[model samples]
Target: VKVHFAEQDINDLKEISATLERVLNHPDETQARRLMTLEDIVSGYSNVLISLADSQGKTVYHSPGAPDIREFTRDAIPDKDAQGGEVYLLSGPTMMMPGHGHGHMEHSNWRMINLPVGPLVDGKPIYTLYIALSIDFHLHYINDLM
Candidate 1:
C-alpha cells in the first residue's frame, strides 16, 4: 500500500521538517552571548526560519538566515498576543514561518516554539534554537528535550 499527502499536506510536512531543524540547531557547542545569539544561528540554516517576537507579536528580533523571506501575511499576528502567564509557548505546525527561497520549503521546512525570556532566567522564551533537519546527521545527536 502507498499513501501520499496532498499538496497542502505536503506543504505542512515541509514545515514540520523546518521545525525539526530549528529544534535541533537551537543549541550548539559554541557559547551563547545571549538568547538572540541562539536565535540568530538557527535562522541561517537552509531548512529553518527563526524570529523573536514580543508579547504583542511584534518581531523584536529576526534571523538573517534566509535574509530575504518575510514571516507572515498579515505583517504580524495582530490581536493575538502570546502573553498571559506562561514561561514558554509552542504553536502546533501552522503557517507561521514562511519558507524562503522556495514554496513552503519544497524540499523541507519547520518552525520552533516561542518562550518567555524573563522566567527562563538563563535564555529568553522568544529565544529558541531554530533547527534544520535536512542537513548533516547532527540531528541524530540532538537532545530535543532541551
Candidate 2:
C-alpha cells in the first residue's frame, strides 16, 4: 500500500502551512496579493485543495484548479477533529437540481490535514489552514502494490 506516501504529505502540509502563516501575516503584503498567492503556492498539485479559514471557521481562500472546491464550504469537507493523513470521502459539488440536464459532479476522494496558522491567542490561532490530497492520484498504484 502507498500508506507511507502520507509521510511526504505531512511534510508538505507543515512547510506550506508555515509558508502561509508568513505570507498571510506579512504586514507589507496586501490582502489581494496574499489571497492570490494562495493559489500560486498550491499550483504544483492538480489534485490538491488548500484552503484558509478564519478562527470562526469561515473559509478565507480556496485554491483554484480543484473542480469541486469552488462550491465547497468549509463545513462540507468533513473531519473537523482529524489532524493528519486521515482519509475522507469528499463529496463533489452539487451542480444540479431535479432534471435540469446537468451531469453528476465527480467525487474525487481525498486525505486531508489541518493546522492553525498565524498568532495563537487563548490557544487558538487566527486562521486555520487545510491541505487535502486526492487519493485518486495514487489509488491505482496502491491497489497494485497491495
Candidate 3:
C-alpha cells in the first residue's frame, strides 16, 4: 500500500511556490485581502489547501474553506530552512477541508506538501505557505493502472 505522488503532482507543488510569490509581489491584488489570493489558488487547483504562517509559527491566513487550523502552527508542522521555497511531504489523516456530514468516516490516509515562502529579512523567512495536495487521487490512479 505504498502510495506516492506522480510527476505532475510534484510539478504542481513546485508551481505553487512561484504562484504565491507572484501574488505577494503584487500588492494591488492582496493589499488588504491576502486570504482572497489564497482562495483563488485553492480554487484553481484540485484538492489543494493553502495556509500562511508568520515567523513566530502562528497562522496568519488560511484558505477560505479550510477547517479550523489556526491551532496548528509551524511547531506542529514540518520544519524547513528560512532561506525559502522548500517542499516537505507529510503523511497522515490529511484534512483538506471540513468533513461533509460524515461524522465518523473522516479519517483517511493523506499527504501534504509544505512550501516555505520568504520575505528574507535579515536572511530569514518571515512567512511560510503550506500547501497540502491529496495523494489519494494519485494512489487510486496508479491502482487502476495496475
Candidate 4:
C-alpha cells in the first residue's frame, strides 16, 4: 500500500530503460556496474534497487546497490505479470526470495513496479524493466505528520 507512482514515474522509468539498452543488451559484470551508475543518475528513491529481466525471467542487469538481487533470479518467478505496453506495477519488497538472515529489521518496506519493453507478452517478453522503490522511507514522512 505504500507504493508511490506519481504521474511522471513512467518517464523516470523510461530513462532507466533506455540507459540499460544503451549500456548493453547482455552486460557483463563491469557493464552491469555501469548500468547501475545510470540508474543512480535517474530520479529514484533512496535504498531503491533497479533491475532488468528477460521474458523468461533471466536477469540481464541489476543495480549493484542491491546485493541480494541475484538470488531471486536464480529460482524465483515473478509475483505478477506486466500490464499495458512496457509497464508493470508490482507490489512488494526488493528481495523476492530474501535469504535466511534477510529480514527487514529497521526499514519500512517496498513495492516493485515493472515496466515492459514491448507491446505485450506473457512470459515471452524480451526485456522487463523493474524498479524496487522503498515504501518504508515514504512512511516516515507520514509518521512525522502523525
Candidate 5:
C-alpha cells in the first residue's frame, strides 16, 4: 500500500518553522535565547512535537512527548524545495505521553516535517527544525467533519 498524507500535516508545523528560521538566522541572539519564546509556543500545542538541532548534531530544544527519533520511519517522505515536506512515521508503542494509557501506537501515527532553519555550509544546512503531529489528528479533523 502507498503512504497517504497531506501538505496540511506539514502546515501544522508552520508556526514553529517560522520561529526556527528567525532564531537560527538572527544576528544578535542564539537559538536558546529564543527558546523561551518557542517553548511557550510549544506548550500551547498538545498534539505535536518540535525540536531544533545544529550542524554538529546538538539538539538545542526538544519538546517532550516524542518517541525516539530512530523510531521514525520514512518511506516516501519528500523535500520541501521540491514541493514536498519531509514526512515520516513515529509509530510503535513508545510514541505517546503519560495519557497514552495502555494501548499500542496502533491507534495513531505521527507525521514529522524537517526543515532547514539555519545557515548552509557547502549547500548543507547548519541548523534543522523537526516538527511532528499525530497523523491521527488529521484523520480526526477530517473524519469529524463528516
Candidate 6:
C-alpha cells in the first residue's frame, strides 16, 4: 500500500491549520466575517480549500472556485465530548460529490480535516471548521518525484 500522508503533506496541512487558527481567532464577528470573504480565507492556497459548516451539515462558508456551499456536507464531523469539546481529526481521502469545479475535469478525491468550534449551546455543537486539500495535486507531486 502507498503512503498517503507524506512528510510534506503533513507539514503543509499543519501550516493550513495554523493559518486558519490565527485568522479565526478574531475579536468579534465583524472582523471574522470580513476575513472570511478575503482571498486569504476563500482562495485555496496551494490547492487547499478552507470551509465552514453548521451542526446540521450545511455549508456556511467556502473558498472561491469551490462548489456551491449547498454542495458541501458535514459527514466527517468529529465526535464531541460531554462538555461539547471535540478532537479534530484528519479524515481519510474521499470523493467529492456531484463535482462541479472544472467542468468535466475535476478530480474526485480530497483529504479533509475537520475542526469543531463554537460554544456549545445546551450541550450541542453548533459549528465545524474544515480544510480540504487536493489529493490529485499531491499525487502529481509524488509522480513528479518518481
Error of 5 at 2 (Å): 11
For residues 28-112, write the lDDT of model 4, one tens digit per residue: 4454565655566533444456666777877776665344343433333332322344333333334332443655433324334
Predictions in order: lDDT:
0.35, 0.58, 0.56, 0.49, 0.59, 0.53
Per-model RMSD to reference:
12.7, 7.0, 6.1, 8.3, 5.7, 7.8
lDDT of 5 at 35: 72
Candidate 3 has its poorest 10 consecutive residues by lDDT at 74-83
Which residue pairs does candidate 6 place in steric collision?
none
The segments of candidate 1 whose C-alpha lies over 4 angstroms from its true place after superposition are: 1-32, 67-70, 73-146
What local lDDT score does residue 131 receive in model 4, on the 0 to 100 scale?
Answer: 59
Q: Cα miss at 87, model 6 (Å)?
A: 13
User: Which residue ranges in model 3 land beyond 4 Å of their true spot?
Assistant: 1-4, 28-31, 68-110, 118-124, 141-146
Global Cα lDDT for candidate 5: 0.59
lDDT (tens digit, per residue) of candidate 6 on 106-146: 44445555676544555865667776665565556667887
Give the per-residue lDDT digits (tens) of candidate 5, residues 11-77: 6566657765675666666556667666676667666667677777667667665544433443424
Candidate 2 C-alpha lDDT tens digits along 84-126: 4243435553212233356533326555666677555667678
**Backbone clash numbers for all candidates listed:** 17, 0, 0, 4, 0, 0
Clashes of 1: 17
**Model 6, residue 11: what's the lDDT?**
57
Rank candidates by lDDT, best first. 5, 2, 3, 6, 4, 1
**Deviating ranges (above 4 Å) for candidate 6:** 1-5, 29-39, 42-44, 68-108, 118-125, 141-146
Over 16-116, each residue of candidate 3 has an lDDT whose tens digit, in order, gives 76887667545455434655665676677746666777888777777655463333333244323212334344444345445455553332233345545
Clashing pairs in 4: 86-116, 87-115, 87-116, 88-114
